[PDB]
């Protein structure tokens with residue numbers, strides 16, 4: 001079997017045994033000196049997680065509430081790092097290649113995924129530019145070598161509707177060629193008035209074995225979102241407190257007129273080539289091209305009107321964006337012994353090239369009453385247009401040696417990146433340009449006791465281009481993450497249970513900062529995140545599956561020029577916890593029935609960086625019920641019922657500032673039918 005670039009991990013219920021996210025080569029979770037979580041297909045289905053972001057709500061060290069109920073983008077806040085949270089997603093070993101300085105961030109639909117792997121903390125040594133919180137790797141469904149056919153249909157509240165199919169199998173007598181074809185159409189009204197979500201997608205994959213030494217997998221992914229749900233927010237003033245009227249803004253309130261529009265087309269093609277040279281030497285090339293179009297028209301609230309008392313001031317954003325992106329990763333691995341030491345030595349060259357053409361519009365809109373709005377006044381007073389061509393190039397050369405000797409498992413990593421970023425202002429003709437090089441490193445040591453207890457330590461580094469620029473308008477120095485991590489993992493042999501504790505201390509340097517009167521940003525800011533994560537997978541009964549998590553996060557601006565030094569970032573709960581359980585009857589009359597549910601806790605959050613107002617804590621409840629009607633003599637047919645936020649709590653999930661607060665999703669009920677053959 002082929003380790004390089006594959007997880008190759010067994011999965012049973014909600015627990016995987018192996019990953020490649022931390023190493024680019026199959027490694028037991030138990031023998032990996034980093035915090036790795038895995039969210040299985042079964043967990044996604046059982047919790048009715050409708051997006052990647054929602055799939056993470058049972059994982060420690062992840063906050064799922066950055067823009068509350070919005071499903072437009074996947075925001076995964078890791079270890080309290082909210083900034084550039086959209087850019088944490090990798091798909092099939094490759095950076096998604098969205099542009100986080102634009103509206104062109106992509107979304108991968110969960111129905112195409114086999115599993116979600118989550119790596120905590122700085123991880124640039126294998127991936128290049130990334131955030132200090134970690135990163136998420138989506139693994140797409142791959143061709144099967146036995147015929148597999150699934151049709152599925154879902155119906156819910158809020159006008160939810162989905163149909164999908166998933167067909168796979170061999171094409172030849174010899175079973176050397178196999179396909180998979182997955183398609184999907186879906187819709188929702190949301191909780192919000194006048195809002196639609198809508199998506200049509202298809203993903204063909206073909207896998208071909210040339211010999212026992214070579215597999216090529218060809219992949220396409222075409223997705224059209226002609227509607228983009230809701231992506232707004234409203235003041236703390238009337239959400240966290242009553243405003244004037246003694247009113248609160250409703251969880252269904254819509255701040256825009258029907259001059260609203262979000263149209264996203266994503267067109268991806270790629271391949272994965274796996275080649276065994278020797279029992280020692282293996283090589284792999286992962287490639288993906290992306291081409292997307294985004295069209296946006298959005299009127300949004302921004303603060304209360306100075307003159308008109310229960311009306312919100314509004315503005316308009318308009319965008320027409322075309323994103324092109326190439327990414328390739330070239331890996332060569334040698335597995336070999338030198339005396340008592342076994343080496344798994346990886347060398348790699350990767351390359352990212354991105355161009356985003358953006359035509360931006362903006363203006364002033366009419367004011368809107370925040371209770372009993374009257375739509376139809378959609379005239380916009382337009383400000384100056386703002387058109388850009390943005391380019392990024394990243395070349396990475398990296399080395400890694402995993403050294404296993406006796407019960408020790410060591411990891412040594414080094415990477416050099418050459419980065420070039422350009423911004424051509426097509427309105428003004430001016431061009432900002434920037435080229436630099438960064439070295440990142442990682443060192444891990446883990447001791448595997450033969451009882452399945454594994455203490456470890458890790459030092460790991462990250463960088464990311466700075467989103468801010470100086471006086472001159474050449475960008476600041478890239479931010480930098482540095483983490484010391486101490487952990488303990490434990491799995492009792494055979495028992496399908498797995499427990500981890502992780503302690504972390506992350507420093508992020510060269511963060512943009514200024515005096516508030518000041519014009520120039522300088523790269524003198526610093527952020528420190530430290531804490532504890534606990535994760536438990538317990539499979540008792542063989543009919544009973546449990547997940548539990550606890551997260552403690554202490555994050556602070558340790559150096560700031562703006563008066564917020566020593567404050568806690570907003571959108572950063574100190575305390576979170578979760579628990580999910582699922583029971584299946586094999587035994588009795590009830591064979592085929594399954595019942596499940598859980599609870600999620602988010603602690604209090606600051607609504608603002610100035611730390612003047614709290615978002616209250618909240619506990620949410622989820623539940624499910626499933627039946628295999630196979631058991632009653634009609635095979636491959638099963639149904640499920642899910643309710644997330646079962647008590648229908650009406651709450652603010654988080655705030656970006658005092659002006660922008662986001663409601664959590666109201667009760668979401670779905671009924672699903674799955675038909676195999």
Ligand SMILES: CCCCCCCCO[C@@H]1O[C@H](CO)[C@@H](O)[C@H](O)[C@H]1O
Nearest residue numbers: 157158159189190192193194195258
């Ligand atoms: C069980 C709950 C189902 C309610 C679905 C929410 C849909 C509310 O929003 C709908 O959006 C349309 C688009 O402009 C409007 O024209 C409709 O009048 C409005 O009902």
Ligand SMILES: CCCCCCCCO[C@@H]1O[C@H](CO)[C@@H](O)[C@H](O)[C@H]1O
Nearest residue numbers: 482483484485486503504505506507
């Ligand atoms: C879990 C242990 C964390 C110890 C480091 C915290 C002290 C401040 O931060 C440290 O500053 C040092 C420079 O003085 C650097 O060498 C370290 O990489 C950095 O983490």
Ligand SMILES: [N+]
Nearest residue numbers: 302315362363
């Ligand atoms: N504005």
Ligand code: NA
Nearest residue numbers: 041144148150
């Ligand atoms: Na399957």
